[PDB]
Design a protein around this ligand. Structure first.
Ligand SMILES: [Ca+2]
Ligand SMILES: [Ca+2]
Length: 124
């Protein structure tokens, strides 16, 4: 679920404010997305939107209000490493992995200030 994704980010990058840092960053990070991502970070964001798209398309997953962000799963954090619990259902595990791959991905992408609060209408 959304709050658990903010929290996995905080797991992978301990000195971060997720909403402050990665929301309205680039082409993608925020709501929807458009164009080509501006850098590796924005790309991480794009892959995550795609990862959620795929999930919405498993016939066997029907999310509350159609939003995978409402879906709680089980995971834990340990010395920087995120684990998705194996006992998540197939739907819960898919979301858990999207969030997981996006947190790690974030943690490795360079952070370019010029790209936070981008004029998307113009560059996206
Ligand atoms: Ca997005
Ligand atoms: Ca659940």
């Amino acid at each position: 679920a959304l709050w658990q994704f903010r929290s996995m980010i905080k797991c992978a990058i301990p000195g971060s404010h997720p909403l402050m840092d990665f929301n309205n960053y680039g082409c993608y990070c925020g709501l929807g997305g458009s164009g080509t991502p501006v850098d590796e970070l924005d790309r991480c964001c794009e892959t995550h939107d795609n990862c959620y798209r795929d999930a919405k398309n498993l016939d066997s997953c029907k999310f509350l209000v159609d939003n995978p962000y409402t879906e709680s799963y089980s995971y834990s954090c340990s010395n920087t490493e995120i684990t998705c619990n194996s006992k998540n259902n197939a739907c819960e595990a898919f979301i858990c992995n999207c969030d997981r791959n996006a947190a790690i991905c974030f943690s490795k992408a360079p952070y370019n200030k010029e790209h936070k609060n981008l004029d998307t209408k113009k560059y996206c």
